[PDB]
């Protein structure tokens, strides 16, 4: 009996298949989150600066109140 190297292909490994595809981001939907984070960013920040004004006037009031200084 002769024994040589046997042939096997099975699945053929798929000859040239695309793996690159669009994922997560679509296009217009990313701008809704992108610019949406900006509008949420300013509104949250400016409310803190209005709360800073409560401290600001109260800080300068200490100088006016102190005349024996």
């Amino acid at each position: 009996x002769x024994x040589x190297x046997x042939x096997x292909x099975x699945x053929x490994x798929x000859x040239x298949x695309x793996x690159x595809x669009x994922x997560x981001x679509x296009g217009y939907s990313m701008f809704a989150v992108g610019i949406g984070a900006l509008l949420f960013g300013y509104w949250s920040m400016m409310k803190w600066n209005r709360e800073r004004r409560r401290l600001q006037i109260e800080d300068f009031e200490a100088r006016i109140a102190l005349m024996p200084l």
């Binding site: 490994x13 798929x14 040239x16 695309x18 793996x19």
Partner: protein, 54 residues
Amino acid sequence: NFSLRIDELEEMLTNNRIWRNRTVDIGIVTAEDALNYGFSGVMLRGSGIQWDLR
């Protein structure tokens, strides 16, 4: 396992802005003067003439 391994480079190098910035428009030679150098593999095969030895 090879088909996924080679396709890992395309999602790494070809899709990126850097390669479309750097390698794009360097020595665009495809004319009869490009044929007057004789590259056989790539170049003429890569751009222009549909000739191949295979």
